[PDB]
Every structure is written in C-alpha cells, then in structure tokens.
Amino acid sequence: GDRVADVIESSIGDSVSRALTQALPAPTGQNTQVSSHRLDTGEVPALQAAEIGASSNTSDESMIETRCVLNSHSTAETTLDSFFSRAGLVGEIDLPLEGTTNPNGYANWDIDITGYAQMRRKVELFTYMRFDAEFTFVACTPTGQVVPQLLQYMFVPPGAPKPESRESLAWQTATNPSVFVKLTDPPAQVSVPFMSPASAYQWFYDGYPTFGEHKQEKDLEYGACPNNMMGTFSVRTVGSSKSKYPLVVRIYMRMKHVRAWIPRPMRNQNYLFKANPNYAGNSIKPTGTSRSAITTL
Amino acid sequence: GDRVADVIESSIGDSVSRALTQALPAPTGQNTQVSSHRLDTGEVPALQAAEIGASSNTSDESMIETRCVLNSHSTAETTLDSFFSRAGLVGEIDLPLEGTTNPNGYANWDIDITGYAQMRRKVELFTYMRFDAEFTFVACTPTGQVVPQLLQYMFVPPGAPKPESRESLAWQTATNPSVFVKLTDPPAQVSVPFMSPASAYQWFYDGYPTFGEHKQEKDLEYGACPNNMMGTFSVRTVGSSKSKYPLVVRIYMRMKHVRAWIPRPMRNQNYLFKANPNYAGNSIKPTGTSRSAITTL
Amino acid sequence: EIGASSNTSDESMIETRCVLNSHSTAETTLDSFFSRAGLVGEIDLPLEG
Amino acid sequence: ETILEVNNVPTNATSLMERLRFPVSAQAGKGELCAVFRADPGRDGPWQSTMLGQLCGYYTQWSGSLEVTFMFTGSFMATGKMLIAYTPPGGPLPKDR
Amino acid sequence: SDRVAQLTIGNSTITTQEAANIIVGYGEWPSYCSDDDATAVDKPTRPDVSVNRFYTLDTKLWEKSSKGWYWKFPDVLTETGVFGQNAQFHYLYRSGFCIHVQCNASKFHQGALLVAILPEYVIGTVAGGTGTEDSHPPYKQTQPGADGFELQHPYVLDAGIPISQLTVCHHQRINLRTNNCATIIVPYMNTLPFDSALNHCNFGLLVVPISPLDFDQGATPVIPITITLAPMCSEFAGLRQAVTQ
Amino acid sequence: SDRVAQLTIGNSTITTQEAANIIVGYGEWPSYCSDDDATAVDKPTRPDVSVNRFYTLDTKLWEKSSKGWYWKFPDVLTETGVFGQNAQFHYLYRSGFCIHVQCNASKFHQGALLVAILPEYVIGTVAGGTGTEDSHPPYKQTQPGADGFELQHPYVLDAGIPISQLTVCHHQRINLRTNNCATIIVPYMNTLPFDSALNHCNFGLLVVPISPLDFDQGATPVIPITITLAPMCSEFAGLRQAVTQ
Amino acid sequence: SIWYQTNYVVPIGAPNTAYIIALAAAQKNFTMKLCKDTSHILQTASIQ
Ligand SMILES: CCCCCCCCCCCCC/C=C\[C@H](O)[C@H](N)CO
Ligand SMILES: CCCCCCCCCCCCC/C=C\[C@H](O)[C@H](N)CO
Secondary structure, three states, X not given: OOOXXXXXXXXXXXXXXXXXXXXXXXOEOOOEOOOOOOOOOOOOOOOOOHHHOOOOOOOOOOOOOOOOXXXXXXXXXXXXXXXXXXXXXXXXXXXXXXXXXXXXXXXXEEOOXXXXXXXXXXXXXXXXXXXXXXXXXXXXXXOOOOOOOEEEEEEEOOOOOOOOOOOOOOOOOOOOOEEEEEOOOOOEEEEEOOOOOOOOEEOOOOEOOOOOOOOOOOHHHOOOOOOOOOOEEEXXXXXXXXXXXXXXXXXXXXXXXXXXXXXXOOOOOOOOEOOEOOOOOOOOOOOXXXXXXXXXX | OOOOHHHHOOOOOOOOOOEOOOOOOOXXXXXXXXXXXXXXXXXXXXXXXXXXXXXXXXXXXXXXXXXXXXXXOEOOOOXXXXXXXXXXXXXXXXXXXXXXXXXXXXXXXXXXXXXXXXXXXXXXXXXXXXXXXXXXXXXXXXXXXXXXXXXXXXXXXXXXXXXXXXXXXOOOOOOOOEEEEEOOOOOEEEEEOOOOOOOOEEOOOOEOOOOOOOXXXXXXXXXXXXXXXXXXXXXXXXXXXXXXXXXXXXXXXXXXXXXXXXXXXXXXXXXXXXXXXXXOOOOOOOOOOOOOOOOOO | OOOOOOOOOOOOOOOEOOOOOOOOOOOOOHHHXXXXXXXXXXXXXXXXX | OEEOOOOOOOOOOHHHOXXXXXXXXXXXXXXXXXXXXXXXXXXXXXXXXXXXXXXXXXXXXXXXXXXXXXXXXXXXXXXEEEEEOOOOOXXXXXXXX | OOOOEEEEEOOEEEEEOOOOOEEEHHHEOOOOOOOOOOOOOOOOEOOOOOOOOOEEEEEEEOOOOOOOEEEEEOHHHOOOOOHHHHHHHEEEEEEEEEEEEEXXXXXXXXXXXXXXXXXXXOOOXXXXXXXXXXXXXXXXXXXXXXXXXXXOOOOXXXXXXXXXXHHHOEEEEEEOOOOOEEEEEEOOOOOOOOEOOOOEOOEEEEEEEEEEEEOOEOEOOOOEEEEEEEEEEEEEEEEOOOOOO | OOOOEEEEEOOEEEEEOOOOOEEEHXXXXXXXXXXXOOOOOEOOEOOOOOOOOXXXXXXXXXXXXXXXXXXXXXXHHOOOOOHHHHHHHEEEEXXXXXXXXXXXXXXXXXXXXXXXXXXXXXXXXOOOOOOOOOOXXXXXXXXXXXXXXXXOOOOOOOOOOOHHHHHHOEEEEEEOOOOOEEEEEEOOOOOXXXXXXXXXXXXXXXEEEEEEEEXXXXXXXXXXXXXXXXXXXXXXXXXXXXXOO | OXXXXXXXXXXXXXXXXXXXXXXXXXXXXXXXXXXXXOOOOOOOOXXX
C-alpha cells in the first residue's frame, strides 16, 4: 500500500547489481590493425591521466606505424583452472617411533595450507576463493624407503571428537570419513567439496571472531576465520602395538572448479608464521634488487 | 526501482486515512419502530460489556414493547454553529483618568479569551478549534453614560511595535489595521479570519515552547502555545491632551464557521488564572451536590 | 497436551522477508546417514594365548 | 517437540526428574528473572536432552529456525504473564527486563 | 473468537487469553503524512521495524490505597531503543501508538481500572491550596518519563477536570472478573503534521482504580500493572546533533 | 564537463572544481541484498537518508616527513550519528560507501598521494624485528577509529605486501597540479550478505604520499587532508541492546 | 531469557508454586549438513 511519491519514486529495494562492465570472449590475443601517420590536432591518444585511477587505453596503432598481425596466441593458460590445478605441498606429518612430536603412533594435523610458502603466496594473491580440492597422501620412511605398513587417514571435522591415542574409539569411523592404505600401494587420492559455511574461503579476515573486550590476553584471535577451519586430519598406524617403521606423510593439494575474487598485492617479504602476515621489521628487503646508479645499468 | 518483495508488499507510504466510520445524515431524531414480546434464547440485547470501552448499542425496541413514533425533532441546535455563534464577553478594558492601571490615555490588552469563565469553559470543552470570529466593542463610562469621544482601536500583531504612549508613532496605522469610532455611534463590529500558523488553535498545549533545560526559573512557559498569541489589541483616546471622560471598553466575540476536534471533560472546578488549569487543592468541590443517604433521596 | 507439535511459523510471529531457501534435504536421508562404513567386529588370530 | 531441560542444576540420582521442569513462584513484582539458556543446539547445555541436539551431533553445520514451546503445569486458578526474550548475538546477559 | 488476541508488530508479539477487544482511537488508524498536508521538504526516514515494535516500560503495584498514575507520550520512549535515538537526532516526529496494559489476578480478586487516553493532558497545581499563588509544576512532574507519576487528586485528574467524564476520550476498563488486558490504538493527534518529541507531548495515559482492589489474606497481595506500547507508522525528519531535552 | 562534480546524497552536498572523475569499485554499484542471496528471515530496516549521507571524520596534516595513514571501515562510523547507533543496536550490517578525500594546495606546491581501498587489510607486526616473536597488534592499532593510525613501514603497508602493487585495488591519485579530490565508490564486499560492523572490518583506506610535499618558505606550510565518506544502500538486521565493542 | 512480566497470581488454597516444561523442536526450513561422528556422548571401552 504505497501512496506517497517519496516511496513510489524510490530506488530502495533495488537488488539488481548494476554493473558498468561486460565480460566478452577473448580466446586469442588481440589482433593488430594497420596504422599510418597522423598529423592532426585535438586528438592526443598518448596523453593520459593516471589521476583518474584508470589505466591507459592507448594502442600501438595510435602511437607507432604498425602492420596487420593476426595473433593466434591462446589465453587458456592464464585461467585459474590452469594456474591452480597443480598439486603442491600443503602439509607434512611425521610419525616417528621416539622423540617429542608424535612418539605414540598417532598424529593430528589441523588443516592450514599456509605452512609452505610456495602454495600460500599463490592463493594469497586473492582475498576470496571457492574451490573443490583433491588431496593426495605420499607416505614413506625418512630415507624414502617403502615398507609394508597399514595406515588410517581419518578426517575429523569440527565438533567431532579428536582421538587421544592410537587405541581410541574415534578410529571406528562410523560417520567420519576414513581411508585405509598400504604403503606398498600407490598414494591415496580423494576429492573434496567446498565445505565452508560461507560462499568462499578467505585467507585474510580483517576483524575478530568473538565479541567482547579485546585485550592483550586474547589478542591471538585477530584474523581467525572459523569459516576456514575445516577441522583436523588424523593419522595412525593401525594396530594395538608399537610399530617399527618410522613414517612421514606428505599432503599434496590440487584445486578444481576454482573461482576467486578481489586480487591483492603479492607478498614480497618472507613469511614467518601461519595465518599471520607478520614480517621482520629489522630486515626489510626490497621487492626487487638494486643498482648503484640510475643512469648506469 | 523496487525489486525485493519486502518493499513491494509494503504498507509504508500509505497516506490514506483508513476510518472505521461514516458520517450519515441525521436531520431529525431517530424514529421508533413497533416491537413485541420476545421469549427466546441466545440473543440478549440488554447484556453488554463496558469493558470493551464502547457504549450500549441497545434500543427500546429490544427492551420494552414500543409503538411507532415518528420523531420530527431537529438536530440543528446542537451544531457547533449554533452553540458557539453567541457573542460573549472575552475582555474588558478600562481607560481611567487617574489610578494605577492605565492613567495615560492608552491601554494594551493581550488577546486571551480565557479571562471570563462563561466563554472559556465553553471552548475548553474541545482541544482544537478553527474559526473565524466577529469582535464587537461596547465602549461607555463606568456609569453607562454615553459621551462624545473619539477612540482608536488598533490591532498590533506579533512582531509589530507596541505603542508606548498616546502620542506614539505606531498609531499612524499604515499597515496595521485600526478602527476609529465615536461613542455616540453604535458599537464597532469587525469580522476576523483564522490567523494562526497552525491548522487550529489549541487551548491546551502539553509541552514547552522553547528548547533547553527547564528549571524553576522559567517554569511559567509550561503550556504556552505561540500559535495562539495573535497579538495585542490597543486603544487610546485620539488626542494630544488628556481626556475628561473615563471609559470602559467591553469586547464581545462571536464565532463563525466553527470546526472542533477532540472533546474533553468539562471543568467542574473554579478557574483561578488565565491559560492555566490550576485549582485550589484545599477547597476541592464535587462536580455535583450531595445527599445524606443513598437509599433516601 | 494434544501430543502434536507446534504448527506455528515465523511469518505469523515476527515480521519477515522473502527468503528463497536453496538448502538441500539430501544429506539427512538414511542412504547418506548409514552408508558410512563403520567397525562392527574385530577378530584376533594370535599364535599363543 | 521433545523436552528441553533448562534446569540442569542437579547432579545426583534422585533429582534427575527435577531437571525437566523449572519453577514459577510468586515474587515481589519488580520484573525479576526466572531462567536463561542459550539457543545453541549442538552446544553442551539444555539441548543435549533433545533429539535435535543429538542428531545435530552427527552433523557439522546447521541452518534454520527453531521452536521452543513452554507449557504451564500449574493450577487452573493460577494466572500470570511472562516475557520470553530472544537476545541475538552480541547481546550480553541482560541485567534487567 | 474475541477474548483471544495476538498483536504482532515487528519482532515482538503479545498473546492474550482474556481480552475484551481492541479500541481504535477516534475511528482512525495510524497513517503517514500526505503530500497535501506536509510542509517540510526534507525526505523523512521511515524505519519500519526497529522502532515500530513493543517496548515495556516498568511496573506499578496496585495496592489498596492506590490513587492512579499517568504516563506522557512520547516522553516514555526518548531514552529507550532506536526510537529514542532518532527522536534525539531528529527535530520532528510523527507516530501513532498501540498501548497495552496488563493486570492479571485470580478469580477471587476484584477491582476495576480505567485506562484512558487524554490528549494534551496539561497538568495543574494546587495553587498552594489557598488559590493565591500562580505556581507551576516542575519538569519532574510534567514529563516524568517511563516511571510515571502518581496522582495526588485523582478526582479532578490534577487539572480541574473530572474523572467521571473521561470516558468521552478513548478508554477501556480492566475488570479482573472479565479481562486482564486493555488495547488502545491511537493515531497521531496534532494540529501539525509533525512536532518535536522532546518538548511537546501529544497525549497522556491515565490509569485509575475506580473500584478498590480487594482480596482475602492468603492470596497474593502483589498485583502489578505493566504498560506495553508500540509506535506505529513512525516518521522522523530534520537531522542534527543529538539533544536530550 | 569532467573536472566539476556535485555529489548529493541525503542532506549533504560536496562541490568540487578540480576533480578527476569518480571511480566505481570493481565495476559494481552498491545495492541491496536479494532474496536468493539472503538467509536471515528478519525484515531489515533500510533508513535511507539518516545514515546514507556524508560524514566528516578528522584532518591529517601532510608534512614533509609524512609516511601514511589508514582508516578501517566501518569502524569510522560506529560512534558517529544515526548510523553508529543502529550498528550498535543491531547485529548485522550491509552498506556500500562513497569515500571522498580532500587536499587543496596552491599552484606552487607539489606532491602526490595514493588513495587506495584494500579489502581485508589485515595488519602485521614487526615480530620484534628479529622475527622470533609471534606478536599480535593491539586493538588501538587494528581498529583505530576515525582518528586513524599512521604507518611505520609504508613500503610493505605494515603487512608484508608492497605499496607498488596496490594499484590493482581501487585507487585514485591526488596530484596537486591536477586535482585536489579523490572519489571512490565502493560496493559491499564480503563472502556473506551481512556481517557485524563492530567485529569485522570490510576494507581499509590507505593514504600514502608517494611523492614528498615541497614548497618554498613564504607559502602556507599546513596542508591538511580530510576524509569525507557516505554510506550507500545501507541495511541493518537483528535488533538487541546496544553494545560498543 | 524468561522474565516475570506481572507476577504469578494465585488464590487461597491453590499452591503458591508451579513449574513450566520446555519443549524444543525445529521448523520446515531447518537443514543440517556435513555428517560427522557425535562428540557429546563417549564410551568406556571393554564392552562385555
Ligand atoms: C580422508 C581425509 C580427507 C581430508 C580432507 C581435508 C579437508 C580440507 C578441505 C580444504 C580446506 C581449504 C583450506 C583451509 C583453509 C585455510 O587454509 C586456513 N584454514 C585459513 O588460513
Ligand atoms: C480592529 C481590532 C481587531 C481585533 C482582532 C483581534 C484578533 C483576535 C483573533 C482571535 C484569536 C482567538 C483567541 C486566541 C487564543 C487563545 O484565547 C489564547 N491566546 C490561548 O489560550
């Protein structure tokens, strides 16, 4: 029941996203047209204004004398599908016999793919990502030796009970997904869906997850997105007793059906911690290498 | 540009005043129909619920055995036109020769019609009133004697300069309206429009006119509507010298084209001040007279 | 006391907006809830004991 | 609808039936507090006593509206009025009505 | 199908099992201001659910020797919620109201309350008793907030006008044998389409026991009364800094 | 017909005589949330003029040895106006923004500023310098309000990412020979249709002098920079008591 | 949270105290996702 003119003539409730742009097919590189000399006034395609924040709309047809070039170079290798569907190391778990880390035949590894710099920097180019994945578990001895041993790879989502030992009752995998493998067999390989409560993962969360006063005590919460905590990956030696082969499981993740939003500046400083864009402020390095003089190369 | 359903299905901006009622013509009193005996169950027109806040919808056709009466009694004397178009005293100004009130041949009287109880209580039955008026000035001597004297009746609206004496330069009435009369002639009588900035006068203003802290110092502002302060009525003896006839001007106001909103309880206690519903709390009187016993008349 | 459950809504109890729910009921099926291999037995064939 | 046991105060054996109903006595009329409980089904609290709170343990993510039905188990001549408020997130424990 | 009611507006809901009916004040529903009637050119903000919802003020105890209480509108909601911040941040205001008064008691209690809406309930003074002093009421008593103020002389409503004729305004009666709620829906009443919420009060809400509460000891002696009220069709205009008074 | 602009939204108006143009962020205009994309069933309040209007935060002085400043959004407007009360009174929030940065100087001054919008500008620490400590930034520095916070290491934007590649986000450049304003229109950016204004910050606004300010003495040495920003297409949902942090 | 709006009123003879029974459910728009193994029930080993 709308009667006044201040609500009939309104734009409130306009859910349609008005865009200035339009994605057009670019299967090949842009071709070049033939260009001649211009000796005129008024039109100046070389003078720009970067103050507008836009980029140069210039060409080489407008700036030099060019020939017709038919470009048959494909733009198919710069897709996200090709750039990210390359299995990289995201984790590495050791099941030693003795020591300090995991001397009791089991190990839990909380999923963060931000422990090795090669795959981190490649995903931290973007702010939001939505992808399926394919994990692959390459288990072996420190020496690389392959051994006849049976393992159990359990996925423990959030809320589910983490196993406290090797003979714990969570390994029964009644509703949790698990995988059994021999190491004499090939590496395991499972495909995974997009499992977050949000429409995408996000490697940078500018804010705090919990309400309340924010003191120096619980300051470690800054940047923690629980929409990214997909849980825990556990691994044991299937048995009632101690094994005799030390083991190392390496995890290799490959994305599929990738979508990404909001590119960022790529990191030029060295990572130091996980899920934390900290740096060494004493040893700041330039993102390039130096000269001695600007006139001499 | 309305797209969501939470704004298409809305009633926001519905300016039409949805009323449950309808004014129908009632020129005469309601006629009576013939009624008989009823000896039935289910229908009980005498049992009501005043808890609903409504009034009894009963009849005498439903409660006694009645005859057909054709009522030819008119409802034309209870109109506001008839009830208020009766000229009553609203003010009384004295122009004595000596004394304390106005010994200098002029007198200003700020317009409030709430100085005599007979016309006040009759307008204070309502909360809002919008009317034209007709003022009438009956000037004479204390003894009632009529004398050959010329007067000037100036209306001084708000903002306009009040006259400080008889020979002041505001009496020149260049844009202000004035009236000259002899007292040997009939009473003056001018018609007046509805002159307020609001859509109606209001005899009760529940609030303060000025912003700011409200202390005991400026507590007299409570109830002051400046939408009712139509100004000042001034009167002098036209002359450069002192008169010799003492005078009393009486003002008699009559409404026309009356409209009124929101009836109120009529006052049962005595007025004490102007524009102020105060009472003597020690001598509270009932709005009726008493008995000695409820069983004996 | 009837033993039935509340037939109420949020359309009847608060002022709501049109929400088009595209959440699937396909994971609460018995097919999905039970087709998950779990341990039901464990047998030991020792040498002695 | 199954029983949401708000009065999860007792711990011993005999008073485990006290845990399914919370009391309503006469007060001084100053708008006091009767009871409070979180609206989180999978969290450890009153909802563990509900089928919703036990099936949601077998799942990791949930979405939708909830119902809470309160039934008065007092005399027919008893009468009263109560305010059952839902405080969305961010809201601390209210100190007053 | 009349003694039960569910008043749903916004994110709030009042259920009643012992209602009488709903009174609509002067036969008009609350509404928004037309373009014919408006004068201010600013576009008003119309927040539809954050301020149009039920608020709950405080409780008053109906004792034997209770005389009555009044609550001035919209002074009740100028320190309460998103309504009372917009009223501070804006200069103008326009809303109707749905008032709801609750008083529950047994079938062995008895009493009656008159719940009336009096527009422009200007307050008077006892003039020192003698009638000589042109005294004026304080700000504590004129606009007392949501804790209300009690009447000293409820026969004359502390203004010289009698309680008997107050049923010419809106009213319902809370008879503890018959009902425990009273719903009055009030439109906007003013000579002006808009006015300031902090200086002008549009009406007052009177709650007066005409019949005294009575019960035999053994029963519950504490019988509260709670005022519960919703703005309706609210509008705000004229935006500047926040001022309280 | 490009160097002049009048940005009118609400009861506010910014005139410019030395503009470049208006940047629309990622080619999307601010909008409201669809029924497909929404999940919360509550009806959101959409106040159209009381919060969609230009606010003016504070001034920063461009000196010779200035390094840069950042302002986190919507932390700038949580203690300011009718916007910052609804954000307190509600749990959710959704709005775009129109940022406007002013820096006026003569035709004998020179300098350049980069004015960039970086989403999810997470802040890093120097790790004690050595790189051994997993230190974390305080609340003063993460969310500093409308008085902003200055950068210590602006080459890496205090997050280990270089200033050079920041022109892949939204940006304009304030070249004192060419312009004195920079208008960026930002949509709502989140994985979620709604989020809380008090815990999550959607983006940061970086203001960095790439070229140092220079003038000969005799001129005016005080060159302020003022941030002026309007919410657009704002929406609120989930009403409870007001909480500040 | 549950607050006394008015009071719990009772006549002579009837009991001065009662009890309320809460009954929780869900609605037609409720959905669950990503099946796991429950955590708020554990088991002491050595069944039989
Ligand atoms: C049988 C074993 C299957 C194991 C399946 C593991 C599920 C993992 C899903 C991929 C999660 C994406 C990466 C997670 C988010 C981010 O790296 C961090 N949590 C946030 O910095
Ligand atoms: C030549 C002389 C003409 C005099 C005309 C006088 C104009 C008066 C217009 C009628 C005003 C209505 C009465 C005024 C309002 C109330 O009585 C009080 N001011 C408020 O209590």
